[PDB]
Write a sequence for this structure.
DNA sequence: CCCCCCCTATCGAATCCGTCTACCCCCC
């Protein structure tokens, strides 16, 4: 009962939900309990992916505004925000890189690139976890995480 | 001028290599 879930399938719905959260927590400054401390977005790419494409510019502005409001929320109100994303071209010219282009790369503070192992030991919960960007510690370290036997 | 993003199977070819023997009949 302490885990609250809301469905948003368009960027306007997500913006409205986050603005409502900001307003409610601003009104709840007096209170000391019941205020959410962790905010999780299941997929920020799926909502904004249809808005990209073409030679227009409103999609980039919308995603930048969403990033700015997320950053203001997390900084001002001391919340931990976690979002997900997808990968882009794996061809020879372009390495495995996060989606949403170059402009989104400056938004987050920490990047964790989940991956699957190949050959022996594949399948199951065996996934390789790496830290791409942290801006606080050396990067490029690979570890192992099991989910099938975890919880 | 500048932005972000992907595809799909095909044909047929080319012969080699010999083993094993059995079984007697009839008087002036």
């Amino acid at each position: 009962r302490r885990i609250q879930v809301v469905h948003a399938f368009d960027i306007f719905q997500m913006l409205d939900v986050l603005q409502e959260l900001r307003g409610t927590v601003a009104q709840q400054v007096t209170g000391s309990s019941g205020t959410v401390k962790v905010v999780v977005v299941d997929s920020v790419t799926a909502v904004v992916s249809p808005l990209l494409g073409g030679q227009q510019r409103e999609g980039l502005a919308l995603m930048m505004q969403l990033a700015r409001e997320l950053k203001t929320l997390a900084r001002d109100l001391g919340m931990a925000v976690v979002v997900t994303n997808h990968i882009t071209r794996d061809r020879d010219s372009g390495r495995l890189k996060p989606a949403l282009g170059r402009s989104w790369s400056f938004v987050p503070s920490t990047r964790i690139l989940l991956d699957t192992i190949e050959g022996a030991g594949a399948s199951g919960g065996r996934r390789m976890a790496c830290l791409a960007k942290s801006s606080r510690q050396p990067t490029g370290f690979q570890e192992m995480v099991d989910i099938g036997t975890w919880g």
User: Anything to note?
Assistant: The first strand of chain A starts at residue 38 and ends at 41. The CA atoms of residues 125 and 150 of chain A lie 8 Å apart. The radius of gyration of chain A is 18 Å.
